[PDB]
Write a protein that binds this ligand. Sequence first.
Ligand SMILES: [Zn+2]
Ligand SMILES: [Zn+2]
Length: 140
Amino acid sequence: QLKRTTMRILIGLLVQNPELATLVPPLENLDENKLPGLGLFRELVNTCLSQPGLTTGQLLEHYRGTNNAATLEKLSMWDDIADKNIAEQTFTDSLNHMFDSLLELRQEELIARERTHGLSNEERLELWTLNQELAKDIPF
Ligand SMILES: [Zn+2]
Ligand SMILES: [Zn+2]
């Protein structure tokens, strides 16, 4: 009866449909500490890209023995996301929500940085840009 969250959907859908990994943009320069589940998601995407065509069982086997194995097992049997017809649309929708979340975190970071240290011209333009566009047992 797992409740839906952005990272649960992304990781769950990827485990159940590893071919979805090809839809993910490069995540190399993201800070996994800013978003629970992001580090795991990025690991899974890299595994899938390393072995095109791998099945769900082959993906889960690669992660046997890791500290996330039990969580991926649960997401692999999570039938709330099991529908194949809407899987891809749900994946790309949730991808955008994840990056939306990172935008909101960055805006909050720049606001805090502005009070404590002030902003550079580049950072102040970034904050202005964010303000305009943002106005318009599983641990994640
Ligand atoms: Zn590996
Ligand atoms: Zn949406």
